[model samples]
Target: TIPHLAIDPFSLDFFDDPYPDQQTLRDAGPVVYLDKWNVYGVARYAEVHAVLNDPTTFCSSRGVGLSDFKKEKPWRPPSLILEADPPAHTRPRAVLSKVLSPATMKTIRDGFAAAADAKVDELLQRGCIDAIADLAEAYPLSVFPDAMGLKQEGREHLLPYAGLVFNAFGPPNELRQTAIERSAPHQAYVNEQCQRPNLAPGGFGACIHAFTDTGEITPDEAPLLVRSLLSAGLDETVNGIGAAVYCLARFPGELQRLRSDPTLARNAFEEAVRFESPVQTFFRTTTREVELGGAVIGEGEKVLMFLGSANRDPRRWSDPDLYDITRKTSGHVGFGSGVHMCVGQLVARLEGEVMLSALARKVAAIDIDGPVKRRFNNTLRGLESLPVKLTPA
Candidate 1:
């Protein structure tokens, strides 16, 4: 029999600080049935990785939200890749593989690097700043939309659209309801920006549309694919950068370590993500009756994989609760794993590496100057405001 717990992970009270409850969930058993949500959960690192890697049995084709697409009408059209299975998942994934390839990333990395340096230079002059508003969200907003070839005028819609998509992954509670209320206008902008004509030449957004010429995808699928990039690209990177900023402020020794090496920016960002997992949890449905940790999860059952908890699971990581940039954080589920791993992860690392390296070069240390406020969403975790005072090198 499985351990049963009555937990409301979706509640506002729970979302504010989840680690303590998450630890309790993991300690209870490898497989705990949440009597509150009526879903099985896997918080241990080994099981989460196994579930993500072996999509054959623990599949994502069903709605990744608590709402099952088979039973309820999806809030929006299902993502071509994110909510799809193998035969349907293969083509778009190949397209994704090509677009974010090292060569393609190298093209934008240099452009973003120059921008990152300038952005840091501008911020250093201010002395005290909101790291989340000034740096984290601003940096990605400056780069990703242009990289995707989104038109300049209506680009502000990206953030809200991304927010809606990520939060809607959780249950339809107040957090999601608030986002839904103001969603229509931004969704329109996203729809307009996704058009091929709206995509700038020489941008990856344009490159995605080119696939239509080769019959790789239909003419209609082009805009939606572009929409996918816009929705997935910015929020994750913004949160990743926010997590890094939060970690650096919270751990000055690690910040000093990053300042000393500079090259450690990549690992520092990776560790930050592992420590403050931006996208905390995601759901996968069982393909059939399956045995996990001596408990049977029936077919089509929703199983929440606590990526945040999995990253912090002491069973797999050394001093999992501590923030250490030097730790081997490679296997963390922050960006997920296996076939459906975040295709945009490389882009995120590139963004983080450049900005952090640039910040490391300019600042000797960045310390918390004021209160930090957390951003509330259904599944993602990030800061709404993080005040920091910088000391020049």
Candidate 2:
């Protein structure tokens, strides 16, 4: 049985900044019943890690949100890869993983780095820039379309579509309704681009179709899977890179450390992930009775794993709230954990490193001029705008 604990998942206080609530829940017990959402929540590091890694014990098939895929109207067609468990998720993940293999990443690294450098140089010349819009959004929006073999003409639709899809993972409120309204205009063009004929040859979309041809997956499954990749990949990368810049700029000493050791780019990215945690929370369902932190979780109950909270759990790290680039945060659940861990993490990390290095090379100092704003979504903890003054190197 669980503790007689309660936390409202949808409260404004929780949404605005959840760490305090997370800590309260962690102190309450391992598995706290959210009366409002009628779900179990794992706020502590140990329990959340257990739920994420043990897929068999906690199935993802019912979708990873508040809705039960077995009953409620799904927010969208379930993510072919993100929503599946074990065998169902294995092959598609493998196919996409192969496409984003280390070698392929290496092949594109220099070009991505160059693109990032060019954008940073342009921003540096301007002296002042919205890091989120000018640099973060620009870099991924440039590289992702080409990597996916998507044409540049209608590519502007990507971010809004991704924002809507990710926001739908939370409550259907004004934010979600607004995104739906915004994306209605470009839905057709976006859908059309998913067709095999429309995708450029040798791109990720083309590869999905090729997998369909090889009998590994159905033709119907290809586009949805590609859609998942697009929905999952884009805005989160931009938000993450933006947050990294926000962190480094606020802590100039850390920036100095990074400048002295460029290789700290990897640690810098990891530190940003730990600090902000791009995708805040995801759900897992209990498949069988299990005991965690002395609490018994029953079958079929949804478990909300606060990835953002776990990344900063005091029990797991000293001064958990501090954003230090040199910390050993490699095992942090910022990208998730175990078999269901983010497969696109390498891509995200590479994008972050490229953008950060580009800024480091061209800008002598990055300082904030105004308060940063967060673009609230159900799943993504992202920046709306980060105004910065850049001093060219």
Candidate 3:
């Protein structure tokens, strides 16, 4: 029998400090039944990896949150790419992959790099800054929206909209409902911006729409695909950069290691993503009765995967608790694995690499200026304010 634990993973208390509970789940066994949500929990690396890779057995179309779409209507329409299974997921995933391919990243690299340099220069001049607001939030907000061809008038809505989206991935508790109540206007604006007439030529949104001409995706489907870009892209990367800078500020040695070889910036960012785990949890529904950790789970059972825990599972990596940028982090599921892995990862990687490299080149020391404030969300782990004093090289 799987261990049954009564844990409220969606509570703010848990979000504020989750590692302890995560450890409990991992030590319990490979599979645990979360009595509170009537769902299964998997915190170990091996099972989480297996579940993510074998999507046919652990399906996402049933909803990657506590709610099962088959039993209840989704709060919003399901994501064509994030929530669809094979036959429906195939074409859109291909279209989006092509749109966000390495070639597209190359086109934007020079522009993003210049922005990162200029941003770092400004922050260095300020001498003191909030790593979250000044650097992480500001950098991605400035560049990503521009790349997406969104007009500046309502750009403020982006983060709130993304925050609401991530929160909605959990049970419809107080947090999710409150976020939904506040996000109607932002959601509307995002939808309008995804349309063809609103998108600028030569932008990512424009590229997505271009697929309509080849019938790779229909005209009606193009805007929704652009919506996918907005829905999944911004917040995770912002938090990732926040996590990276926070790690450097706390672990000065690692920053020095990065400073010694600025080329390690990208891998350092990957390590932070694995270390901090910005996207913390996702649910996958069982397609049939399956045995895990010697226990049989019935079909349509929702299993919550603790991505944050899996990243830190001692069984997966040596000294899993240590944030070592020099370590090989090739298999980290910080950016979910398999077909449903994040489509915008290349974009996040480019931003992280540029931002961290610029810091390594211009700043010699990162000192914590004040208390770091955490922003708690159902699915994201990040800072609200990371007060820091930057010493120029």
What CA RMSD would candidate 1 show? 1.1
* Pairwise TM-score winner, candidates 1 and 2: 1
lDDT of 1 by residue, 1-393 (tens): 898888888877888889899999999999999988889999999899988998989888888888888778887788888999898888888887788888898788889899899889898888898998899999998888788877789777778888999888998788788887868898889888878888889888888888888777888887877778977878878988988988888888998888889999999889988988888999999999998888888998999999999999989999998888889887999999988899988899999999999988998878899988888889888889999987778
* Model 2 regions more than 4 Å off: 4-6, 177-187
Q: Model 2: per-residue lDDT, tens digit, 209-239?
A: 8888777788988887787777788978888
Return the lDDT, model 3, position 393.
91
| TM-score between candidate 3 and the true structure | 0.99
lDDT of 3 by residue, 157-253 (tens): 8999899889989888888999988577988898899999999888899999998898778999898889888888889999999999988998999
Deviation in Å, model 1, residue 352 alpha carbon: 0.4
Show model 1 residue runs off by greater than 4 Å: none
How well does each candidate superpose onto the true structure, as a TM-score?
Answer: 0.98, 0.95, 0.99
Minimum summed lDDT over a 10-residue window in model 3 is located at 179-188
RMSD values for the candidates in order, in angstroms, are 1.1, 1.8, 0.9
Question: Model 2, residue 56: displacement in angstroms?
Answer: 1.1
Q: Give the TM-score of candidate 1.
A: 0.98
Residue 326 error, candidate 3, Å = 0.7
Please tell me which model should have the higher lDDT, number 1 or number 2. Answer: 1
Instruction: Please report how far candidate 2 places residue 353 from its true position, in Å.
Output: 0.7
